[PDB]
Amino acid sequence: SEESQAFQRQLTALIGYDVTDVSNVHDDELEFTRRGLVTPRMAEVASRDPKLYAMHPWVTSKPLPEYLWKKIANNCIFIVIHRSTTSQTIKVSPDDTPGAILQSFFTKSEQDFVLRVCGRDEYLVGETPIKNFQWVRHCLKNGEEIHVVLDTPPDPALDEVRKEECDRKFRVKIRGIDIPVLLTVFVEANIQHGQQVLCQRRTSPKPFTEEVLWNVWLEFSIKIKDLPKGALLNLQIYCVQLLYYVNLLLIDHRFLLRRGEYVLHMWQISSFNADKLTSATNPDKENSMSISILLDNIALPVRAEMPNQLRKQLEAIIATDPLNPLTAEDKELLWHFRYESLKHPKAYPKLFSSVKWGQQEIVAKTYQLLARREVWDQSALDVGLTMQLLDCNFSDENVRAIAVQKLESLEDDDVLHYLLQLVQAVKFEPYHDSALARFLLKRGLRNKRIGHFLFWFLRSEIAQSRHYQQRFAVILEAYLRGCGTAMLHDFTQQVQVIEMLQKVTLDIKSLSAEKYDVSSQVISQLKQKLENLQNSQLPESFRVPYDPGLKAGALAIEKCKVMASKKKPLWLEFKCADPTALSNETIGIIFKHGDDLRQDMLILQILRIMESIWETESLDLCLLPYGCISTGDKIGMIEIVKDATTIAKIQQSTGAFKDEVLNHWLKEKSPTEEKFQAAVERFVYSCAGYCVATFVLGIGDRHNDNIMITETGNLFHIDFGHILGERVPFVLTPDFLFVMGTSGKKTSPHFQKFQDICVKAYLALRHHTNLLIILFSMMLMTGMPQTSKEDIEYIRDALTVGKNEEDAKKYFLDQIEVCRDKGWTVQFNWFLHLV
Ligand SMILES: C[C@H](NC(=O)c1c(N)nn2cccnc12)c1cc2cccc(C#Cc3cnn(C)c3)c2c(=O)n1-c1ccccc1
Numbered sequence: 109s110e111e112s113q114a115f116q117r118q119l120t121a122l123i124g125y126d127v128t129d130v131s132n133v134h135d136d137e138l139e140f141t142r143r144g145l146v147t148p149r150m151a152e153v154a155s156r157d158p159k160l161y162a163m164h165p166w167v168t169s170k171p172l173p174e175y176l177w178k179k180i181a182n183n184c185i186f187i188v189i190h191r192s193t194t195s196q197t198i199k200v201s202p203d204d205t206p207g208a209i210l211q212s213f214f215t216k217s218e219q220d221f222v223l224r225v226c227g228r229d230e231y232l233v234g235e236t237p238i239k240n241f242q243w244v245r246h247c248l249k250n251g252e253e254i255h256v257v258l259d260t261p262p263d264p265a266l267d268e269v270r271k272e273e274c275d276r277k278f279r280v281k282i283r284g285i286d287i288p289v290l291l292t293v294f295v296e297a298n299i300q301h302g303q304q305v306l307c308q309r310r311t312s313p314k315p316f317t318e319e320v321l322w323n324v325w326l327e328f329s330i331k332i333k334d335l336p337k338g339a340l341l342n343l344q345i346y347c348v349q350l351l352y353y354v355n356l357l358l359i360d361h362r363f364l365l366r367r368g369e370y371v372l373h374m375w376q377i378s379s380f381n382a383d384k385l386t387s388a389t390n391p392d393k394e395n396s397m398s399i400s401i402l403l404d405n406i407a408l409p410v411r412a413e414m415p416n417q418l419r420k421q422l423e424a425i426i427a428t429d430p431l432n433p434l435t436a437e438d439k440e441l442l443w444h445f446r447y448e449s450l451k452h453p454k455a456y457p458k459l460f461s462s463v464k465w466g467q468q469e470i471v472a473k474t475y476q477l478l479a480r481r482e483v484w485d486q487s488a489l490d491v492g493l494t495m496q497l498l499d500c501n502f503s504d505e506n507v508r509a510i511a512v513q514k515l516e517s518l519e520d521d522d523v524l525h526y527l528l529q530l531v532q533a534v535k536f537e538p539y540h541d542s543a544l545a546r547f548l549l550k551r552g553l554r555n556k557r558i559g560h561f562l563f564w565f566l567r568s569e570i571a572q573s574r575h576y577q578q579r580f581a582v583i584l585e586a587y588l589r590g591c592g593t594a595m596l597h598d599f600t601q602q603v604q605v606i607e608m609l610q611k612v613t614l615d616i617k618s619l620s621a622e623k624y625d626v627s628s629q630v631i632s633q634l635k636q637k638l639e640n641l642q643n644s645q646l647p648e649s650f651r652v653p654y655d656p657g658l659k660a661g662a663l664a665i666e667k668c669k670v671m672a673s674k675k676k677p678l679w680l681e682f683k684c685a686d687p688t689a690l691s692n693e694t695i696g697i698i699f700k701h702g703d704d705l706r707q708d709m710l711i712l713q714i715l716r717i718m719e720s721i722w723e724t725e726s727l728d729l730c731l732l733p734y735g736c737i738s739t740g741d742k743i744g745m746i747e748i749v750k751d752a753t754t755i756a757k758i759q760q761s762t763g764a765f766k767d768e769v770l771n772h773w774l775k776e777k778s779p780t781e782e783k784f785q786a787a788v789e790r791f792v793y794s795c796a797g798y799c800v801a802t803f804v805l806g807i808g809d810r811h812n813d814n815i816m817i818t819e820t821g822n823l824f825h826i827d828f829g830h831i832l833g834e835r836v837p838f839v840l841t842p843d844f845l846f847v848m849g850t851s852g853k854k855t856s857p858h859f860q861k862f863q864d865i866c867v868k869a870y871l872a873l874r875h876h877t878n879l880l881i882i883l884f885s886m887m888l889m890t891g892m893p894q895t896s897k898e899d900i901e902y903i904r905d906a907l908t909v910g911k912n913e914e915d916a917k918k919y920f921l922d923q924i925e926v927c928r929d930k931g932w933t934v935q936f937n938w939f940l941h942l943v
Contacts, residue, residue, distance in 0.1 A: 125581040132391040137361045141540040145586040152553045153590045158264035163231035164556040166242040168521045174726045190257045202239035226255040227689030228657040257688045267592035274332040283400035284321035291316035297326045298342035302503040306466040336465045338503040338538035352397045365406040382535040382890045386575040426455040453487040457496040492879030498533045512543040520555045528713045531565040532890040553590045560656045571740040605650045613699045622674030649685035654735025660695040661685030696748025705744035707829040710891045725872045729797025732824035751819040756812040763939035770843040777819040787821025794823040796865040799838045806902045808838025836934045840927035
């Protein structure tokens with residue numbers, strides 16, 4: 109069909125990679141996967157409700173927190189409903205549905221009308237009490253009135269989906285290696301299963317020539333039958349240093365033992381990270397190192413009661429943290445008493461890490477154990493635990509599948525919380541098709557909000573990671589074929605605008621080097637390029653990728669500008685295309701090159717999780733995880749927080765610092781004394797929040813230039829990629845303390861409170877130690893370009909694993925005192941080392 113080839117062309121532009129391309133593939137797993145993902149696509153497409161899908165209501169089954177109960181008048185909530193002009197405030201109890209409140213309204217075609225939010229693509233619809241809608245909870249947190257506009261439901265017609273159309277020892281021959289351009293070298297051959305080396309053979313050393321030929325059989329001690337599925341033949345070249353690596357799945361996607369002539373182009377090194385695991389080969393055929401190999405070698409098809417001191421010992425092991433490495437003794441015990449270990453869900457990661465995966469007999473027994481998982485099946489979903497099983501330590505389908513099963517019960521609100529980290533977790537899958545990928549796919553097709561971010565998270569990786577672009581593309585394509593016509597058009601708009609505004613960000617950066625500030629003619633160039641794009645190619649309105657509720661429209665070219673930090677990022681402002689919008693405040697977007705934003709995304713997604721945790725223990729520390737989306741290599745977009753400045757500028761209104769300046773800025777920006785005291789309170793929460801959060805994540809030691817505050821006193825850290833690219837545990841400088849009214853070594857009402865909020869928040873995180881450890885662990889492995897055990901075991905020390913709550917109270921309070929004793933020392937030292 110000529111239609112499908114235009115559609116397939118249409119798809120490739122949205123993805124930024126061609127899945128039909130067969131240049132860098134030596135098997136058809138990628139094609140097999142595309143075929144495979146039709147069934148679950150079409151199933152989910154078929155079973156999804158037209159109406160609710162179109163309106164995509166954002167709701168939660170969670171309780172309303174205490175702090176939001178206290179913000180309510182008298183079991184009564186004021187909703188303001190709008191026509192084309194006039195409006196009426198309605199009194200409503202939190203437990204009313206959108207239908208019930210609609211019935212109550214018309215008293216003052218009833219089922220032909222829906223309560224849309226004013227200024228947003230956000231509907232308050234469906235059998236959910238008004239309190240359970242996220243937009244309502246946002247309004248209640250902020251203390252803003254809840255404004256809606258009655259109008260027609262969106263047409264499901266628009267979400268139309270296009271109809272689609274041997275006991276033999278294993279051995280490998282190393283032929284040799286080959287590269288055009290450039291010591292002693294050898295080829296190391298590893299058989300791995302969940303970064304666990306089963307056997308290793310090293311080829312004899314030879315001179316480091318462009319073409320090194322061996323023609324040698326590396327014979328292993330593992331039988332062919334004993335190879336487990338998802339076993340990777342890891343080939344690495346050495347010289348005391350590792351230079352190149354490549355992987356080959358010894359067992360393929362059809363359960364067949366891999367055989368035949370292979371020539372694999374290798375990835376160069378820039379110990380462990382996600383990129384090391386990829387079955388993909390280097391696409392750059394001209395520069396890269398190749399290796400030639402040959403494979404010829406066949407499908408893969410009443411208990412006595414525990415002692416006290418053993419159950420003790422077992423329960424000890426299971427209780428410990430995920431980074432706690434298991435002794436051989438621990439694993440033998442876990443395995444021997446596996447049927448008892450199966451009764452404890454929190455043993456599972458450890459228990460499956462105790463399996464000999466190089467023994468068909470043991471693997472088979474392992475599988476008999478998973479058949480009797482009534483305990484797991486009935487266990488309350490533990491997300492942290494479920495993540496552990498999807499990390500790099502487990503490369504077994506069945507094991508990994510029980511984790512994915514447990515995720516099925518996640519509400520859409522919770523999926524979003526974890527979606528980024530769950531996309532990154534695909535890097536740990538051994539095969540392109542996997543229960544995880546299908547889960548992602550299914551949940552995105554079910555809910556347009558999840559679908560939207562999924563698009564951007566996959567695309568983020570497709571556009572830079574050569575190690576994983578092929579896999580993510582196939583998954584993305586799969587989603588795009590099911591999301592519907594209204595979304596397709598949305599994404600096309602979005603991607604065009606993004607690519608447009610990237611060119612400008614890059615082109616403007618070419619015009620002025622890091623060496624000097626903004627030029628007049630460069631500003632003149634800027635405002636012409638925008639004039640040009642607005643008039644020529646900018647669409648009338650596009651959806652904001654970091655906040656898909658909001659639709660941005662026409663540029664405020666007057667209000668646009670460019671900074672001078674040598675990064676030279678843009679600062680764009682747009683009118684909101686929605687005329688029903690309550691305010692005329694712009695939509696502020698910052699476009700920047702030269703900064704890796706994948707890091708920022710992950711840190712922020714963790715912040716959002718830390719807030720969700722705190723909500724469960726009746727706490728809100730006014731964190732501000734702004735919108736941020738990596739769009740390509742070193743390029744992304746950032747949400748501009750309105751009425752916000754940096755702590756640095758406040759101080760400069762060389763390297764001299766005054767403690768009071770911060771306090772005076774708040775007095776200046778608050779009209780009323782009450783609003784000053786409200787903002788001083790917001791500062792104490794937000795400071796404590798960011799103090800705790802950054803301490804746990806090992807990123808507290810920032811420069812003032814990297815910290816900001818809103819005019820309403822909401823402090824919030826920024827530029828997290830910068831840190832991950834004489835010390836203090838976190839920024840709690842003398843100015844921050846002067847707001848609280850304490851100076852030197854003293855104490856006051858707000859400082860005594862600050863400390864109450866810190867510890868409470870800190871100990872709340874410790875209640876989810878295991879979750880944060882795994883998210884943090886995973887962040888390092890999938891977020892950073894280059895990671896080690898020493899790094900990962902920081903969070904262990906920062907969360908003070910295996911301790912009482914009072915030693916932890918002590919620890920953190922000591923950390924406060926360290927900040928005070930140092931004062932300005934560290935802030936000062938940046939200027940000193942700069943200059
Ligand atoms: C660092 C600061 N960041 C934010 O404002 C901010 C926000 N609002 N949301 N957000 C979310 C994540 C990260 N950052 C943020 C910031 C960014 C920026 C980005 C692009 C261009 C310019 C500019 C400019 C300009 C124009 N003419 N002249 C003389 C300077 C700027 C800029 O001036 N500032 C800045 C503001 C106040 C004091 C010091 C610097």
